[PDB]
């Protein structure tokens, strides 16, 4: 993403393929303005658990991590994006999404595996080593089995945020 | 081969739901006689591949 | 011949043909002769 | 898209103005086309080029390429569609050069050919439509087929060669 202009008047952004965004941490709060296509292709991969090189016009590579993204309504195309400069030891609480691998021993019996909470926020992600995904064992589940956060293997060097007894995934009964 | 399995494991009919409640369970020895009687009906080429052929039938039957 | 305001496919033989300002559909199966006009 | 075009000695292509006259041993046939659509005989064979490459031009490209091939094959060997008379009591005679129908109808249907098309009977139970212009040959033979459309129970009337006509059946 070769960031360039960064004014306060979006008059030179809206007609063209550009999207407004801002990056900050504490010391510097300079408003930005990245490209549409550039972001709609990067954010699809790293989402909010992956940092990407942000070089401003002139030669300034600043590492940042997507925080929150407001979405334009009525249209899938986003309109504003928030970034957060990576600190290096402790910076902010990052949300990590929960996937599912391997067929359960409940899906076959008749039931169906349903994820209660798709995105699971943790405490202290640790820079340089942000968990971009999270693999949870689901095969050990049968009919009515509830797998909380106290059952999910840690990335390493990271801690949970939600209630230890909060059901993340559960196999619902058929029909 | 289904008729042979229903006589060996002593299966009366089968299983409407092979995903919840199965039937019985046999051994590989009973498979040996099956691939030995229905040889003209089998290609499969030596040994195991014929052995793995019958397995696929019992798997979707409830054995 | 069945006149339907919503002429869509029904098999893998229905072929939409744009003639003189009309939406038609030719098909081996004669019961699949839909035409908006 | 189509570029190959079979040209042989017996034909004569004349790209004069908008009227593309073509001569042959079977008879001279005229086939008009467009002016913007470039076309000429380059070297030995004939090529049909097009100004622009979208649809309004490509749609006419293959169009002309084929029609010219039809005039060539028409003046070289000629077209002859072979029909068939299938059914009970179905037959056809000949009166000089006009085809005489006789299929179920109380009164025989007389079909007279236009200028340039000639009928032929091998058989009481076969029809043969010969002509020069490939369009006329079809346009004429067709009329013959319209006389009695193959019914979806016995497949009577007139057909081609063998037509594939599956029977629905009563019953």
């Amino acid at each position: 993403m070769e960031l360039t202009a960064k004014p306060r008047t979006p008059k030179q952004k809206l007609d063209e393929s550009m999207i407004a965004a801002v990056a900050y941490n504490k010391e510097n709060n300079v408003s930005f303005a990245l490209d549409r296509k550039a972001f709609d292709r990067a954010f699809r991969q790293q989402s909010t658990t992956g940092l990407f090189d942000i070089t401003v016009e002139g030669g300034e590579t600043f590492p940042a991590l997507v925080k929150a993204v407001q979405m334009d309504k009525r249209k899938r195309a986003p309109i504003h994006v928030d970034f957060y400069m990576v600190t290096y030891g402790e910076p902010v609480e990052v949300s990590v999404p929960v996937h599912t691998t391997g067929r359960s021993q409940g899906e076959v019996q008749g039931g169906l595996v349903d994820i209660v909470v798709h995105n699971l926020q943790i405490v202290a992600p640790g820079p340089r080593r942000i968990p971009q995904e999270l693999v949870v064992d689901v095969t050990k589940m049968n009919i009515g089995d509830h797998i909380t956060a106290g059952d999910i293997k840690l990335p390493e060097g990271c801690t949970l945020a939600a209630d230890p007894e909060l059901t993340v995934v559960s196999v619902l009964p058929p029909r | 081969m289904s008729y042979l399995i229903r006589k060996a494991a002593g299966i009366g009919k089968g299983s409407s739901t092979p995903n919840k409640a199965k039937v019985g369970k046999l051994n590989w020895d009973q498979v040996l006689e099956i691939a030995k009687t229905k040889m003209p009906d089998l290609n499969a080429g030596s040994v195991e591949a014929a052995a793995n052929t019958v397995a696929g039938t019992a798997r979707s039957m409830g054995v | 011949m069945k006149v339907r305001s919503s002429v869509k496919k029904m098999c893998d033989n229905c072929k939409v043909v744009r003639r003189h300002g009309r939406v038609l559909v030719i098909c081996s199966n004669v019961k699949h002769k839909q035409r908006q006009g | 898209g189509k570029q190959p075009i079979a040209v042989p000695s017996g034909v004569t292509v004349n790209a004069q103005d908008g009227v593309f006259k073509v001569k042959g041993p079977k008879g001279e046939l005229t086939v008009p086309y467009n002016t913007e659509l470039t076309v000429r005989q380059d070297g030995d064979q004939l090529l049909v080029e097009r100004p622009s490459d979208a649809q309004k031009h490509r749609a006419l490209h293959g169009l002309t390429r084929t029609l010219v091939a039809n005039a060539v094959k028409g003046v070289s060997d000629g077209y002859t569609i072979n029909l068939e008379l299938r059914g009970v009591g179905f037959r056809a005679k000949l009166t000089g050069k006009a085809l005489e129908m006789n299929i179920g109808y109380s009164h025989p249907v007389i079909i007279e050919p236009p200028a340039g098309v000639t009928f032929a009977v091998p058989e009481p139970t076969r029809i043969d439509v010969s002509g020069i212009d490939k369009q006329l040959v079809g346009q004429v033979a067709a009329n013959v087929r319209k006389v009695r459309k193959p019914d979806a129970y016995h497949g009577k009337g007139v057909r081609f060669v063998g037509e594939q006509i599956a029977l629905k059946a009563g019953k």
């Binding site: 699809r44 989402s47 909010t48 929150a68 993204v69 407001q70 979405m71 309504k73 009525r74 899938r76 949300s95 999404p97 008749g110 169906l112 595996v113 349903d114 909470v117 798709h118 995105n119 926020q121 619902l172 009964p173 058929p174 029909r175 | - | - | -």
Partner: protein, 136 residues
Amino acid sequence: KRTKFRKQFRGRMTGDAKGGDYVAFGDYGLIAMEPAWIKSNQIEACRIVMSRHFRRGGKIYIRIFPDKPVTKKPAETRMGKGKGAVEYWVSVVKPGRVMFEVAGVTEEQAKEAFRLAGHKLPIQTKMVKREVYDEA
């Protein structure tokens, strides 16, 4: 469908979407693209229909409960006040409000259920996919 207890009457006003989100409580969702009034009965229309296409699962969520009573004309005349207390309940819906959402099933199995449960609706709709992460 219908509320268990309320005041009774109401009014009428349509502003832009407020509390509608791209995805939650499942993987696929169905969003409106025109403001209108979604009758209770229309919701039964959609729900039942999607249950015909889904033998088992029960993973069909409907978080657009109607909370809007509407009046009606009893016979004729105009010499009277509030007419027709009990008619039907309608749930307001603005472009970008998620009405329906399913999961467990595939892609094709979802393009049918929303489709079908789309022809009943007074308005147009489009089916979306995941890649939204606002609040949680």
